[PDB]
Design a protein around this nucleic acid. Structure first.
Ligand SMILES: [Mg+2]
Ligand SMILES: [Mg+2]
Ligand SMILES: [Mg+2]
Ligand SMILES: [Mg+2]
Ligand SMILES: [Mg+2]
Ligand SMILES: [Mg+2]
Ligand SMILES: [Mg+2]
Ligand SMILES: [Mg+2]
Ligand SMILES: [Mg+2]
Ligand SMILES: [Mg+2]
Ligand SMILES: [Mg+2]
Ligand SMILES: [Mg+2]
Ligand SMILES: [Mg+2]
Ligand SMILES: [Mg+2]
Ligand SMILES: [Mg+2]
Ligand SMILES: [Mg+2]
Ligand SMILES: [Mg+2]
Ligand SMILES: [Mg+2]
Ligand SMILES: [Mg+2]
Ligand SMILES: [Mg+2]
Ligand SMILES: [Mg+2]
Ligand SMILES: [Mg+2]
Ligand SMILES: [Mg+2]
Ligand SMILES: [Mg+2]
Ligand SMILES: [Mg+2]
Ligand SMILES: [Mg+2]
Ligand SMILES: [Mg+2]
Ligand SMILES: [Mg+2]
Ligand SMILES: [Mg+2]
Ligand SMILES: [Mg+2]
Ligand SMILES: [Mg+2]
Ligand SMILES: [Mg+2]
Ligand SMILES: [Mg+2]
Ligand SMILES: [Mg+2]
Ligand SMILES: [Mg+2]
Lengths: 237, 57, 46, 112, 98, 15, 225
RNA sequence: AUAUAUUUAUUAAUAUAUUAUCUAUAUUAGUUUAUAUUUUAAUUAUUAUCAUAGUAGAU
RNA sequence: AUCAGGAAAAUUAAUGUAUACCGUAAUGUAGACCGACUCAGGUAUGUAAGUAGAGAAUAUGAAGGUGAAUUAGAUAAU
RNA sequence: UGCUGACAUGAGUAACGAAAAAAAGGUAUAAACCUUUUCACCUAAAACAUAAGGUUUAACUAUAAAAGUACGGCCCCUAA
RNA sequence: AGUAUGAAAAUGAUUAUUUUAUAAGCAAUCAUGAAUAUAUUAUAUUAUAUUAAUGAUGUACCUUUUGUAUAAUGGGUCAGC
């Protein structure tokens, strides 16, 4: 009873219902904002649910599939705006992670709220679709939006991209294809540039994104040079 | 929060300005048991009936 | 039990016992009204 | 219990401002937001940029408002004869006056 | 300002007390009234009451529409026509030359 | 007063 | 259309009902004394010094200005900022005003931006207003620093009664304060202070091992050696 | 029953998707039910909340 | 059954009735009354879904109403 | 243990008074206000309809609508 | 509870000079170094003022008592009465 999870100053029933609701809302939307502790707990619950559904799709054992489906139902409030959440999970959310080994969510910190200085955070799902059936932006992928904004900023300032920016791009690209990542980056550039009131040149941005993704997906071991390494690794005498 | 622009206890009442005051002011139509009837000098027209009605003169 | 709630409002009794007529229709109440007038009070009775 | 003598200015000031745990700490852990060169907290996101992305999401996913046809095709004279004006009490007046009890967040400085 | 006060005469005692303030405490109310009005609204003269207001032509030594000379001021020596009375400070209001 | 001056100036302009 | 800022006559009316926007040296000195002081500061590197015969331009007369330290402090560039009626306590304001001791204004603004305390918003607004004020006065914001910052009760605190249990009583006061600041320049004040500290250091007497320590005590009217 | 697409010079079977398993009369005054009548107004698998953690056997 | 159970203002005929005045909001096991407080106290009536029961007990809760001038963490001794 | 007024110390301490709440949006303004959905709590009540009382506190100034048959008072009649 | 003025004290924050992190008690007096400030006869080997190096001495004040530092009474401070 001590050491398993945070109590959050709530009874067992109220804590469990709180986490159920947080997970259901994170699935219904794509990114939500709440206190850091609640974000972490809901992250645990949501990742466990996604793992169960992935298993339900992958296994061939009917008993296991049925029991896993029942458990997934057990950890949800299938009512109101979330009545078809089961279908949404098995059709859209679960397939996105058929090859990712965990880490389906992410918690990004935010400055505390002014009223009570309670730490805040964004709980978000990794690799969410950016376009809808009609090619318009959807909610979520705040990390991708911020990465593309950083890329635009560097391009406007005429400075090379930072190692951390490139590393984050590599992390996203690991589970995505060149062309689809290119298309997402182009749409995000279009929207962000229109918002920031900077000119959008389709050919120039095509070229810039192509160069960026070539660098991401290519292989080149020399990362400039490291320090002369004032310690030597000589063997024992 | 009764008023979203006052987050802390400062002395403002639920409603009004003062909870107390003079109670020796004259009464009016809205105050009193159901039996209380003060009137507005608007009907000296006719006669009440032995049953409860009213006949206009 | 708890105390403090000794005043139980009722306009009927308030007027019958502390009203203006309740004092103007007697020797003693008339004297109360006259004394309050002499002191210059604004409000003589309920 | 109860204090036995009034505490001196010396004692009160040294008790409050003396120890270093009671003193506010200079915030060293600030750095530059990659999306905009402004100040931000280390291992933290930038509120201007987060809010900008959220605003984009709002503008692109807002649900169309509901404007009933019978009302949107209603004349001004009929609107006046059916839905006349009214006087707002002090509570609702103050409630509507919103810029006197709600603060928007303040932009940080450009780190150079 | 929703009051209905313009339809009835209620609180006669209180209204009379406010309207018959003692003359020796008048500066107390004068201060708040002055400091609670804009510059383009206020005047540098003392408001008067009925018992001393000029109510007849003989009291009003001058009547609007007659030329007059102004002295003891910034416009000393200027000739102007009093455009109207004041009826609040027993004063005159001149034309643009005043 | 300022009220009267403003009113008569409006009327003068209209005339 | 026309706005308050656009209305030029209105701003001159405002500055007529208050004092002109100018520095202490320009507002408090006669023209000749101003010229002498400015020339002295220019020859001396940007700040006054006790004894320097100054040469006035386009004239052959020389001067030697003499001032008190109060004059020295008051004549150097500085900007004075005051806050409005803030709902807080002096004990609460001091917690942050002791952090914003002598920092550069930009650094202090950042600290107020990233502080957790409600007073920080108002203090940052005051500091930004002071930076704008110094820019109007002719000062570069990169040079300003917080020479002084303090808090004082704003007065007319409202008292209310608190009704404890068992007939017991208390009195609750709702305090309002104000925060005021004096910002100075690193190119005048700090350089002058460094000069003075250097002079004091050069004046400091050396330590002699067998020093001529005075023989303390009265003589007594007889030779003890 | 709605919405998009057809098997003839509203619309039948499909691809599905969304919503619902109601109401209303009689059985001597009123409330409940029960059954008739009216209507499309359903009977299997999982799940949850509340009852001291609702309860008992483990861990 | 005994505990032996209020007071008070009279019908047919013929004409007749243009129908005065006042209450009506909301609160009313309460932040809207009595308690020095937006106080776990005091405060009069009727209805108070269904299932289950002897029951107005107890469990649930269909409609309704509500979730509070303190919040977020942490959960040492006590 | 004088009276009144101002200001201190305790001290930025104790407390903030039975309580389930969470997202999205109004709003790149919100723990505290409003809306939607999820979750809970009272349910022979924390619901509905009233009496008494009261700084009209209400869905408000453009404001609480009576010939009577379930409309009370007023009026006739009387008890203490 | 008139108006105007208000460097009156108690009280709060900040700055400046000086002393203070191996020293113990009515917080003051005397003795005595040192730093700083002012000084239009500092001619100086000067004067004055501020300041817990260091040394010695020092058991708050009223009341009431034979007798009180008394752990006997009264006083949080200041302004007015
Ligand atoms: Mg807590
Ligand atoms: Mg669990
Ligand atoms: Mg009351
Ligand atoms: Mg009533
Ligand atoms: Mg009492
Ligand atoms: Mg009696
Ligand atoms: Mg004052
Ligand atoms: Mg209490
Ligand atoms: Mg106090
Ligand atoms: Mg329950
Ligand atoms: Mg339970
Ligand atoms: Mg009523
Ligand atoms: Mg009603
Ligand atoms: Mg009491
Ligand atoms: Mg209560
Ligand atoms: Mg029950
Ligand atoms: Mg319900
Ligand atoms: Mg209610
Ligand atoms: Mg509470
Ligand atoms: Mg605890
Ligand atoms: Mg303590
Ligand atoms: Mg403590
Ligand atoms: Mg506490
Ligand atoms: Mg919000
Ligand atoms: Mg019950
Ligand atoms: Mg029941
Ligand atoms: Mg009700
Ligand atoms: Mg009637
Ligand atoms: Mg030492
Ligand atoms: Mg000691
Ligand atoms: Mg004795
Ligand atoms: Mg002795
Ligand atoms: Mg002692
Ligand atoms: Mg004693
Ligand atoms: Mg004592």
């Amino acid at each position: 009873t001590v050491g398993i999870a945070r109590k959050l100053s709530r009874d067992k029933a109220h804590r469990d219902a709180l986490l159920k609701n947080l997970a259901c809302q994170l699935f219904q939307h794509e990114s939500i904002v709440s206190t850091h502790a609640k974000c972490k707990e809901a992250s645990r619950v949501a990742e466990r649910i996604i793992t169960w559904t992935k298993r339900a799709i992958t296994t061939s054992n009917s008993v296991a599939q049925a029991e896993l489906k029942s458990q997934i139902q057990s950890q949800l409030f299938l009512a109101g705006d979330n009545r078809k959440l089961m279908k949404r999970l098995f059709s859209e959310i679960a397939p996105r992670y058929l090859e990712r080994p965990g880490g389906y969510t992410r918690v990004l910190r935010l400055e505390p709220r002014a009223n009570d200085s309670a730490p805040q955070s964004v709980l978000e799902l990794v690799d969410s679709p950016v376009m809808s059936e009609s090619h318009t932006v959807n909610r979520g992928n705040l990390k991708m939006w911020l990465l593309v904004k950083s890329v635009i900023n560097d391009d406007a300032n005429q400075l090379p991209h930072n190692p951390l920016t490139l590393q984050n791009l590599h992390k996203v690209a690991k589970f995505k294809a060149e062309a689809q990542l290119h298309g997402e980056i182009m749409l995000i550039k279009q929207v962000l540039l229109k918002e920031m009131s900077l000119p959008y040149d389709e050919a120039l941005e095509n070229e810039r994104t192509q160069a960026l993704l070539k660098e991401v997906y290519s292989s080149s071991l020399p990362k400039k040079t490291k320090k002369p390494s004032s310690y030597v690794m000589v063997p024992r005498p | 929060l009764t008023r979203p622009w006052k987050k802390y206890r400062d002395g403002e009442l639920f409603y009004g300005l003062s909870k107390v005051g003079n109670k020796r002011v004259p009464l009016t139509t809205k105050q009193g048991n159901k039996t209380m009837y003060k009137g507005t000098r608007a009907s000296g027209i006719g006669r009440h009936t032995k049953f409860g009605g009213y006949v206009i003169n | 039990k708890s105390r403090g709630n000794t005043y139980q409002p009722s306009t009927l009794k308030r007027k019958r016992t502390f009203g203006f007529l309740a004092r103007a229709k007697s020797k003693q109440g008339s004297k109360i009204l006259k004394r309050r007038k002499l002191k210059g009070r604004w409000f003589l009775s309920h | 219990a109860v204090p036995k003598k009034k505490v001196s200015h010396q004692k009160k000031r040294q008790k409050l401002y003396g120890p270093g745990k009671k003193q506010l700490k200079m915030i060293h852990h600030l750095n530059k937001c990659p999306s905009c060169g402004h100040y931000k907290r280390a291992n933290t996101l930038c509120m201007y940029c987060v809010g900008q992305i959220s605003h984009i999401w709002k503008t692109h996913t807002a649900k169309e408002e509901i404007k009933p046809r019978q009302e949107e095709e209603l004349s001004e004279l009929d609107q006046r004869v059916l839905y006349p004006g009214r006087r707002d009490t002090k509570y609702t007046k103050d409630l509507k006056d919103k810029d006197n009890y709600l603060e928007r967040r303040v932009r940080t400085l450009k780190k150079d | 300002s929703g009051s209905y006060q313009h339809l009835s005469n209620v609180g006669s005692r209180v209204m009379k007390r406010l309207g018959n303030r003692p003359k020796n405490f008048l500066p107390h109310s004068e201060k708040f009234i002055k400091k609670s009005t804009p510059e383009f609204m206020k005047s540098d003269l003392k408001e008067v009451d009925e018992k001393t207001s000029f109510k007849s032509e003989k009291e009003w030594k001058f009547i609007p529409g007659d030329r007059v000379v102004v002295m003891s001021g910034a416009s000393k020596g200027n000739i102007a026509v009093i455009k109207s009375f004041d009826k609040r400070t027993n004063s005159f209001i001149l034309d643009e030359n005043g | 007063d300022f009220m009267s001056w403003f009113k008569r100036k409006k009327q003068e302009e209209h005339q | 259309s026309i706005t308050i800022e656009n209305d030029k006559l209105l701003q001159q009316h405002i500055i007529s009902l208050q004092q002109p926007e100018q520095l202490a040296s320009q507002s408090l000195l006669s023209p000749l004394k101003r010229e002498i002081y400015e020339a002295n500061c220019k020859i001396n590197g940007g700040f006054y010094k006790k004894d320097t015969i100054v040469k006035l331009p386009n004239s052959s007369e020389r001067y030697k200005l003499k001032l008190t330290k109060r004059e020295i402090e008051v004549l150097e560039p500085s900007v004075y900022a005051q806050s409005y009626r803030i709902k807080s306590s002096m004990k609460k304001a001091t917690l942050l005003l002791r952090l914003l001791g002598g920092l550069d204004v930009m650094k202090a603004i950042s600290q107020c931006h990233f502080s957790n305390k409600k007073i920080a918003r108002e203090v940052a607004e005051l500091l930004q207003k002071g930076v704008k004020d110094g820019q109007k006065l002719g000062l570069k914001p990169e040079d300003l620093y917080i020479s002084q910052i303090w808090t004082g009760s704003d007065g007319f605190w409202r008292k209310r009664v608190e009704f404890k249990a068992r007939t017991r009583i208390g009195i609750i006061s709702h305090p309002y304060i104000h925060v005021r600041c004096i910002l100075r320049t690193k190119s005048v004040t700090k350089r002058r202070l460094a000069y003075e500290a250097h002079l004091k250091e050069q004046k400091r007497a050396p330590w002699v091992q067998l020093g001529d320590k005075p023989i303390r005590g009265v003589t007594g009217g007889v030779y003890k050696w």
